Design a protein around this ligand. Structure first.
Ligand SMILES: C[C@]12CC[C@H]3[C@@H](CCC4=CC(=O)CC[C@@]43C)[C@@H]1CC[C@@H]2O
Lengths: 223, 216
C-alpha cells in the first residue's frame, strides 16, 4: 500500500498563498527524506524543496527560498508545502516523492504521489461549454468514422473527458488544452469507430471540469 | 540544469543513448547520477540511481554509465512504449544539494503513415452563442511534421486557427492533430464552403476535406 496522496492544489491569486499536502501510507514516513518536485506546463522537473526524515533539516531551492516553506508529521504521515506568497511562475504540477535510502541517501526518488495542479492566476474559474463533433458524411472513411466533443472556454486546467462512461477508450484522442487569446483553454476529444457502428452504438462524451462544478454528457451523432 | 539533448530517436530494436553533461562538482566527481522516465501525464519513475543501479523490477534494457563529466542512459532493444521524457539528476558538492537535467524526449521511428483526415461543422447548439468552431482532425500520422490550412469559399485563412498535437502514441507510435477554426456566427453564415487541406509526407498531394454550410 506504498503511496503518497497529494491535495491542496488549486487556482490561487498572485501574491496569494496556498498549502499543499502529501499524505503518506504503506511505509515508515519518518525514516526517509521526502521531497517536493514541480513541473510547469510543458517544462521539465524542477527540484523545489526537501526535508530530512525528522523535519530537523528541511532544505530548499533558490528560485523558491524566499517565499516557500516545507514541513512534516510522522504520526499523520504528511508532508506539507505550506506555500505562501505564490506567484504566476509557481504554476505547475507539484509532486512529493520518497528517497528510499534508509541509512544513506540514493539521491533518487522512487515512490511518487500522483501530482497536484497549482495555478497561480488572477483569472477566475470558468466551466467549459461542450459541443458535439458529429460523425459527418463529408469524410466517410470506408470502414472508419470519427466523432468527438469540443470542450471550449474553461479555466483553469484540468478537464477530463471520457466516452460512454469509460467503455470506449481505444481509438480516443483527447488533445492537449491550448490557451486561446481569450485567456481560456479549449480542447477536443475525438474517437474513430467503424462506420457500421454509428447505426448500432450511441456515443456520448462525459466531460468534467471539477474546478467549476461543470459536469456534462454530450451525444455525438449523425446528421 | 544538467545538459541533455532535447530529443533522441531510433527504431524498435535499436539501442539508443541519452547523455547528461555536468561538471566536476556533480556528474563528473560523484557517483550519484539518477535517471527518470516520465510518460505523458504521469509521475516520473526511477530507472537508475548511483550511476549504474536499476531499482528492482526496472527492465535490464535500461543501463546507466558515465565518462568524465557525462553520464549516459542506454536503452537497448527500443520498444514503442519506451517513448517518454527522460531526466537525469545529480548530487552536487556545491550549495546545490540536488539538480535535474533538462530532459530528453525519446521518439520511436516507424513507417510513414499518412493522416486520415476529417472535418466537423460547428454544432447547431454552438451557433446560438454567436461563435462557430470548425474542427479538422488529422489522425494517426507519422512522421510528426504536418501542415494544415483553412479555406473559406476558397480563400486561405490567416490567424483564425489553433492547432494541438498529441504525444507519440505508446502502441502505434503515431501522432494526431486538431486544427480549430474560430469564426463569428455572422461571418460563418455569410460563406458556403468550409475546407481543411492537409499536407503530409505519406500523401502524394494535399488531401482536402470540406463541407458546404447548409448541405446534408
Ligand atoms: C531527497 C534527496 C536526497 C537527500 C537530499 C535532498 C536534497 C537536499 C539535501 C541536503 C542535505 O544536506 C541532506 C540530504 C538532502 C535532504 C535530495 C533531493 C532528492 C534526493 O532523493
Amino acid at each position: 500500500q506504498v503511496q503518497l496522496v497529494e491535495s491542496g492544489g488549486g487556482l490561487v491569486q498572485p501574491g496569494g498563498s496556498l498549502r499543499l499536502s502529501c499524505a503518506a501510507s504503506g511505509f515508515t514516513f519518518s525514516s526517509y527524506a521526502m521531497s517536493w518536485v514541480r513541473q510547469a506546463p510543458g517544462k521539465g522537473l524542477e527540484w523545489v524543496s526537501a526535508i530530512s526524515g525528522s523535519g530537523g533539516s528541511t532544505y530548499y531551492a533558490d528560485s523558491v527560498k524566499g517565499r516557500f516553506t516545507i514541513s512534516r508529521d510522522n504520526s499523520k504521515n504528511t508532508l506539507y508545502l505550506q506555500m505562501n506568497s505564490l506567484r504566476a511562475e509557481d504554476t505547475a504540477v507539484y509532486y512529493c516523492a520518497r528517497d528510499p535510502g534508509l541509512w544513506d541517501y540514493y539521491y533518487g526518488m522512487d515512490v511518487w504521489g500522483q501530482g497536484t495542479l497549482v495555478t497561480v492566476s488572477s483569472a477566475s474559474t470558468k466551466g467549459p461549454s461542450v459541443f458535439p463533433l458529429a460523425p459527418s458524411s463529408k469524410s466517410t472513411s470506408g470502414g472508419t468514422a470519427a466523432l468527438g466533443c469540443l470542450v471550449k472556454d474553461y479555466f483553469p486546467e484540468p478537464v477530463t473527458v471520457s466516452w460512454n462512461s469509460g467503455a470506449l477508450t481505444s481509438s480516443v484522442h483527447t488533445f492537449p488544452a491550448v490557451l486561446q487569446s481569450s485567456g481560456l483553454y479549449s480542447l477536443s476529444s475525438v474517437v474513430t469507430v467503424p462506420s457500421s457502428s454509428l447505426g448500432t452504438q450511441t456515443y456520448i462524451c462525459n466531460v468534467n471540469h471539477k474546478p467549476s462544478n461543470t459536469k456534462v454528457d454530450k451525444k455525438a451523432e449523425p446528421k | 540544469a544538467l545538459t541533455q539533448p532535447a530529443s533522441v530517436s531510433g527504431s524498435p530494436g535499436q539501442s539508443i543513448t541519452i547523455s547528461c553533461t555536468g561538471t566536476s562538482s556533480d556528474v563528473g566527481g560523484y557517483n550519484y547520477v539518477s535517471w527518470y522516465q516520465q510518460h505523458p501525464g504521469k509521475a516520473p519513475k526511477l530507472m537508475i540511481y548511483g550511476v549504474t543501479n536499476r531499482p528492482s523490477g526496472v527492465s535490464n534494457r535500461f543501463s546507466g554509465s558515465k565518462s568524465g563529466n557525462t553520464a549516459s542512459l542506454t536503452i537497448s532493444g527500443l520498444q514503442a512504449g519506451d517513448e517518454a521524457d527522460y531526466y537525469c539528476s545529480s548530487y552536487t558538492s556545491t550549495r546545490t544539494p540536488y539538480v535535474f537535467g533538462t530532459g530528453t524526449k525519446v521518439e520511436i521511428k516507424r513507417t510513414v503513415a499518412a493522416p486520415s483526415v476529417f472535418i466537423f461543422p460547428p454544432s447547431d447548439e454552438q451557433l446560438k452563442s454567436g461563435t462557430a468552431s470548425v474542427v479538422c482532425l488529422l489522425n494517426n500520422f507519422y512522421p510528426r511534421e504536418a501542415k494544415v490550412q483553412w479555406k473559406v469559399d476558397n480563400a486561405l485563412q490567416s490567424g483564425n486557427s489553433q492547432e494541438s498535437v498529441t504525444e507519440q502514441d505508446s502502441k502505434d507510435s503515431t501522432y494526431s492533430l486538431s486544427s480549430t477554426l474560430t469564426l463569428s456566427k455572422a461571418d460563418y453564415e455569410k460563406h458556403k464552403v468550409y475546407a481543411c487541406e492537409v499536407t503530409h509526407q505519406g500523401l502524394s498531394s494535399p488531401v482536402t476535406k470540406s463541407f458546404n454550410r447548409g448541405e446534408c
